[PDB]
Design a binder for this molecule. Structure first.
Ligand SMILES: [Fe+3]
Ligand SMILES: [Fe+3]
Ligand SMILES: [Fe+3]
Ligand SMILES: [Fe+3]
Ligand SMILES: [O-]
Ligand SMILES: [O-]
Lengths: 491, 83, 322, 491, 322, 83
């Protein structure tokens, strides 16, 4: 006979001891633990809601991988990739590039909590979390690798984050901030609570439905499996948060959460937004990226927060508005700047798509509709050089994304400039600026793509030179996903 | 030479436009529109392109030059429509 | 247009088509791309400073750490296949030695020995977990990190066994205070103080090379030979057949941590001056190991012999890598 | 450390002992063993080429099922079945019905060898074989069961063999003969060597390619997995055969093999033939059922046989010819008699299909082409009652299949009648007759569908009464698979 | 048109949605459709006669054998999940007790006991395999057959263990003739003759009810209590810890064969007259069981006690089903 | 009534045709063709349907009846085309 789990679980996490031969602060340096003056004993109240133990873990996760890999091998010879709508293929190539090595780097993020958290429950959970992100990175390399002979773009599942291409910087800007450069307690909150619970759990679900809808079962199974691992380690922020409030640090708690959501929001607005509203086929779309947000992301935040004893962030209202406007910005950026990304952006402004865009976001053609009109005339009329660019957009120094908002009729493109020690920074939104301002030393020193150009770091200082600085090359340089098929409809 | 950031009316995105210390507000606007008119904004030859400091709202006489404008490098400027 | 490749671009021209191990493990850390600014943020953040100092400026130098290769060649998928097998075996033991009430057949004396010498090892084992997870997060290559990744699960694996067995012993023998006493035994028992000092001090060696050495080259063999070899031989000669088996099972894990530690050492010796660097750190830590093996084994039955067997067996691991 | 397999394997099969408290013949009754006067010791030479042992078996087969079932579950919600060309759906529904419970009954067939063979190697191999067919039957029930709410026809994966519907009888006629009613040695030869090695191994491969081609991956994976189990137990006839020849029974050996192939041929000509040449789409066809036969089945037989020291069967020549003619017969039967089978036969005589039929079988339109012409005019001209039937075809008393050959221009439909103890039997080919004749007592007593009708066993004795006797009913009664879509092409 | 169903047609109206077990196991034999002609061939073939006489005309009668349900509810897929686990555990033992040279630590006496009493059991175990596979092929329902299907793999499972262990013992002790002597021990040793007569005679009881009883109700508990319980207790008290464990592992298999045998008996008692039928067959066979347990156990150390423990433990299995 | 098996010219399959002891070879052929002409074989009104025993080849006068033909029940007969 075996014991029932409940009977022994606590001894797995009864692991704290009073050091003597070194001191608490030596063993738990504040820069890595972030114990915040709260005591060892008071972190021992840390109690995770979802519990697992070594033998269960290795047993379950063996199954998950047998499934996934068996399916991959089963479908391989049918080469579905070869026929998929290239809106899809692109969706995928962007995902692997931006995410695979960040998943990997997440294991280190977890590794951090695993060594430096004063909460023993947290330490062990983090070890599994660590194993989870090891899987994710590994599997999300093994899968794209199936496709390397199909196109060089797939090599980017690996290269992307080893480059200075705009997206890689935006990516590393976000992850390094949330999960690589923060103390243990900070990480639990800014990564597992804010980002993983906040966003990627529901995104991964949505992505898996989309994959299925599109007929890529290999990919549907992939995302779907990974998703099953999320809560096991995503849980880790909750208990941390409780302990901080219960213990008179509601403000610091509050602040990291504010920062965490905004930065996560901005990355999300360029990686998921444009896919939902432009790369997915018109018939395959269940809802708008805005409908998806409200329903599946935003209520959940208020739910989560009220329950923790926190308040909605100061910017919440703006956020609500920006749902109508940001991602259309983000999308227009990427498409217009397409030879500088590693997949083929789908334009998504065929007529039918255009009225869908109007239904979901009333006021669209009279704003975002304009710019696209001009682009369209340009390809109608045989002058398509006026739909690639000849300069660089202003990059926000926080999110490392283009500063952009609504234009046309209600044009309202704003820039939240700030001067700080005889240098001028540019901020794509109020919230981005405020992030820098509350923690200036964390960012001061850093330079985004435009700064580097402006400083002579990119040589030759023309567009072809920026292309080599970003490791891009013909064959990976992005063009219109449908080869201007949607053009014929205006003529 | 001088870097500035161009906030062009009815465009979505601020851009980087090199100009020269000697250019007029008028010639600035010429350089700007190159990257926004007929790429993404419709021309308005019923109109004239003015130049205002983005930070505080301040409007610039069509004829003054960069050097006279007291500009912070990299500074963002509006490029609007009037008559 | 650049032509579609045979494999990843960093693995091109390799004679033989790269393995699953190579595909999913190699060249993944990116903070090693800019040693002047590892992280996409201000280069003066404490975390930038931490990696510059404890990873980049290690005295243990190599031109291309990404070169490294785990000889067992472990990936997440093959790790769980291996360990799910090995857990079936151990949970099998617990299940069935229980059925048979193996715990009741043990002597009053051996129970007292289990509480002093066997259970409190949840603290030591967890500290190793902590140790190996620190290596993960500072090592200078993803293939180095990965070996540390799995070893860390192994470490938690051992803590788990001990956790579980401790309940069972508290169930069979409620007045012994199993599961309550271990912390004070860990903190106050001469037999433990050797180990505890070693491992406390080891856990603040931040340099990656020094953490590797302190933890994998000096501390682990000593914990291994003392808690697993010596206590295990004792278990069996003393009627605790479950523990004699438990221990042998965990030593398979240790043997693999040795195999990769050994390869990494083999790798550092391709470069002049590294042997001395390693040797100098060993000679810093070895004394504390001796102190540990003396405080623990001398309190065992047949004390001195255990001390002499462990001392030379842990030494032997290291001699074999030069 | 573990031993290497080679070191201990022999002791797993060193299991014979000399009984004392009972006698050899009591323990091994000749009717179940079929030791054929050959000695215990001389059967101990029996040496299987493909070796496995218990721990390997349960370990490998665990993997095979994790794969298969994980894939089934993965694709389930996409309901591919709902869209498949109904040529496919039909192919499947016929397969499950005819095969699933025969797979099951095969475990008993194996069970027979497992208890009654004097060759110890054979006994253990047969135990695994037994486990293999347990799997096959089980899995080939679990899979169709996914579809029971889609159509009652799927219930037949289970019902079929519990009915007296023509195919069920043809089926049970073949299996009961080869594998349920023969001694251990007989079975090894007539089932594992002749049928499993001879036919279903290569068929299962072919079926899996077809499933994939058709886009049913669930099914492709199914058949593909099962196929991986075949040789492990299919091997069992070879060693038996060697021992019989090496030991002066080449003739008996010879004869069972002759019988085994013909009966297997005939069942194969109605179950696989018509699928290959008529239900598969025209573009999805790699080769003709005749090209497939020669290449993948017939050379292999000569190969196998020469190596064993046997000769090609007396009828081999005829067989070669009959490849041009039988299955087209079989297909025409089924389609014309369609409301009496449980799936929707695909006509397959659209023009393009018709020239394909001519390419592959030159002389076709001037033979099989005719009957189909008349059928076609009939649906062109609005009289489609003349394309269902009003009588019963003459059923061969051996294969329990319709007596049919080439008609039209070279009409050559023959019947191999035989009178035997004041009753007249009908035989669809020379070979069928000869099977009865060499072993009359095995068949004498039996009555095929026509006999039963002719004797008053089917009441009411009209066509609607035969339909109730065969457990068929509207909703499972077979109609044209494409709903006469291919009709429009003549008008 | 007849409407599409919720489940299989033979399972309609069942309150609760049928399980995987029910879906893939129930109502599969078809020869039970025509008891005047089970097989699609002449009704006078020897095989027609065999099934009429030994399956249809069994004195053990029930109106609906398809009713039967394996309480462990085993299907091919769940069988291999269970047993692959249990093999990991046992192969784990072999692997690791070897590493440790467990075989060398056994006494000259115990080795001689292993050759007389332990190895030759490959013949007994195979005969059970044969026995249980005969039940498979004559039982009157697919759910009955299936239980016999898995038990037969279990039987071959045990033969395999013994096969493998016999090499290992021949490797460690080449002059004992392990792997060569077993047949003559099986045929000529008083200790075996009890069992051998029983099982030879059992294997020609063709009636399905009688085969069930002779094999699962009378023979198996006796083999089980004698070769696994008694020899196993001995192994352990005598230092053969591998076999003490090996045996306990196989007894899990036996316990499950008991669970389904028990349910089948529970099922036959729903019908008057069946108890007597079963009891009468038991009373025919029980004597030969006693003869077996006496010839074997009496040759063991502490002979009579083993005889008395086995006799009453095998009896106990049967008393529990009435 | 009488059972026979009909082997109709240019058809693929022999069938079961009940006839009557009193039918003529002619009326047999009428009963047969019902199940083969205009279902699967084309009519030939330039022709006349003869009736021969399938076993041995023997041709039957158009006008004799079943009863006179010395037929084994269930017997197979050819139904051919002549003039
Ligand atoms: Fe992840
Ligand atoms: Fe995650
Ligand atoms: Fe099969
Ligand atoms: Fe088979
Ligand atoms: O993640
Ligand atoms: O089969």
């Amino acid at each position: 006979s075996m014991l029932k789990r409940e009977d022994w679980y606590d001894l797995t996490r009864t692991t704290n001891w009073t050091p003597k031969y070194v001191t608490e602060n030596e063993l738990f340096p504040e820069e890595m633990s972030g114990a915040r003056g709260i005591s060892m004993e008071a972190w021992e109240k840390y109690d995770e809601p979802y519990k697992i133990t070594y033998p269960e873990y290795v047993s379950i996760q063996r199954e998950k991988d047998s499934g996934a890999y068996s399916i991959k091998a089963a479908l391989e010879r049918d080469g579905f990739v070869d026929r998929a709508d290239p809106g899809w293929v692109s969706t995928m190539q962007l995902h692997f590039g931006a995410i695979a090595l960040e998943e990997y780097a997440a294991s280190t993020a977890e590794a951090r909590m695993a060594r430096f958290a004063k909460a023993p429950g947290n330490r062990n959970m983090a070890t599994f979390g660590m194993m989870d992100e090891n899987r994710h990175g590994q599997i999300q390399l093994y899968f794209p690798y199936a496709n390397v002979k199909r196109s060089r773009k797939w090599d980017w599942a690996h290269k992307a984050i080893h480059t200075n291409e705009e997206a890689a910087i935006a990516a590393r800007s976000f992850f390094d901030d949330m999960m690589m450069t923060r103390d243990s307690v900070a990480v639990s909150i800014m990564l597992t609570f804010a980002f993983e619970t906040g966003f990627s759990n529901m995104q991964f679900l949505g992505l898996a439905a989309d994959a299925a809808e599109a007929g890529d079962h290999t990919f549907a199974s992939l995302i779907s499996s990974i998703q099953t691992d999320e809560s096991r380690h995503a849980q880790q922020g909750g208990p941390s948060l409780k302990i901080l409030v219960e213990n008179g640090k509601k403000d610091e708690a509050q602040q990291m959460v504010d920062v965490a959501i905004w930065r996560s929001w901005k990355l999300f607005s360029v990686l998921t937004g444009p896919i939902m509203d432009y790369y997915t086929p018109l018939e395959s779309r269940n809802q708008s990226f805005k409908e998806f947000m409200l329903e599946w992301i935003v209520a959940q935040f208020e739910r989560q927060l009220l329950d923790l004893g926190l308040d909605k962030p100061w910017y919440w209202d703006q956020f609500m508005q920006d749902l109508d406007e940001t991602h259309h910005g983000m999308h227009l950026g990427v498409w217009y700047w397409r030879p500088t990304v590693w997949w083929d952006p789908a334009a998504g402004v065929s007529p039918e798509e255009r009225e869908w865009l109007e239904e979901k976001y009333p006021g669209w053609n009279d704003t975002w509709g304009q710019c696209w009109d001009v682009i369209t005339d340009n390809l109608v009329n045989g002058k398509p050089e006026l739909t690639v660019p000849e300069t660089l957009p202003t990059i926000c120094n926080m999110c490392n994304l283009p500063i952009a908002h609504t234009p046309g009729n209600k044009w309202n493109v704003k820039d939240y400039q700030l001067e700080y020690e005889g240098r001028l920074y540019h901020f794509g939104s109020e919230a981005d600026r405020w992030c820098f301002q509350i923690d200036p030393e964390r960012y001061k020193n850093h330079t985004n793509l435009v700064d580097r150009f402006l400083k002579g770091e990119i040589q030759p200082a023309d567009l072809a030179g920026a292309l080599m600085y970003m490791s891009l090359e013909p064959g990976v340089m992005g063009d219109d996903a449908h080869d201007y098929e949607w053009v014929k409809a205006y003529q | 030479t001088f870097p500035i950031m161009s906030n062009f009316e009815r465009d979505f995105v601020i851009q980087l436009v090199p100009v020269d210390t000697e250019d007029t507000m008028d010639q600035v606007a010429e350089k700007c529109a190159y990257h926004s008119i007929n790429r993404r904004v419709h021309p308005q030859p019923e109109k004239i392109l003015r130049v205002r400091r983005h930070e505080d709202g301040t409007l610039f006489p069509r004829g003054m030059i960069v050097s006279d404008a007291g500009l912070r490098p990299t500074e963002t400027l509006d490029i609007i429509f009037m008559d | 247009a650049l032509k579609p490749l045979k494999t990843w671009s960093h693995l091109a021209g390799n004679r033989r088509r790269p393995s699953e191990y190579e595909v999913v493990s190699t060249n993944l850390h990116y903070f090693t791309d800019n040693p002047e600014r590892p992280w996409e943020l201000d280069s003066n953040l404490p975390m930038q400073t931490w990696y510059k100092k404890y990873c980049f400026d290690s005295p243990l130098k190599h031109d291309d750490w990404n070169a490294f290769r785990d000889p067992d060649q472990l990936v997440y998928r093959t790790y769980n296949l291996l360990q799910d097998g090995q857990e079936s075996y151990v949970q099998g033991l617990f299940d069935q030695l229980n059925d048979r009430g193996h715990d009741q057949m043990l002597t009053r004396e051996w129970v007292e020995t289990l509480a002093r010498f066997y259970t409190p090892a949840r603290y030591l084992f967890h500290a190793l977990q902590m140790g190996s997870v620190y290596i993960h997060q500072i090592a200078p290559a993803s293939t180095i990190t990965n070996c540390a990744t799995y070893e860390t699960a192994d470490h938690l694996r051992w803590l788990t066994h001990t956790a579980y067995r401790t309940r069972e012993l508290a169930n069979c023998y409620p007045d012994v205070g199993f599961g309550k006493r271990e912390r004070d035994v860990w903190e106050n028992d001469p037999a433990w103080q050797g180990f505890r000092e070693l491992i406390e001090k080891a856990l603040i060696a931040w340099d990656w090379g020094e953490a590797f050495t302190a933890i994998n080259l000096v501390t682990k063999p000593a914990v291994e030979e003392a808690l697993l070899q010596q206590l295990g031989s004792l278990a069996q000669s003393e009627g605790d057949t479950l523990l004699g088996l438990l221990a042998q099972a965990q030593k398979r894990d240790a043997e693999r941590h040795r195999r990769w530690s050994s390869a990494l050492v083999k790798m550092a010796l391709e470069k002049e001056g590294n042997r001395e660097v390693l040797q100098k750190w060993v000679a810093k830590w070895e004394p504390l190991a001796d102190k540990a093996i003396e405080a623990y084994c001398s309190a065992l039955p047949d004390g001195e012999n255990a001390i002499v067997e462990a001392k030379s067996a842990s030494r032997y691991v290291r001699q074999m890598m030069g």
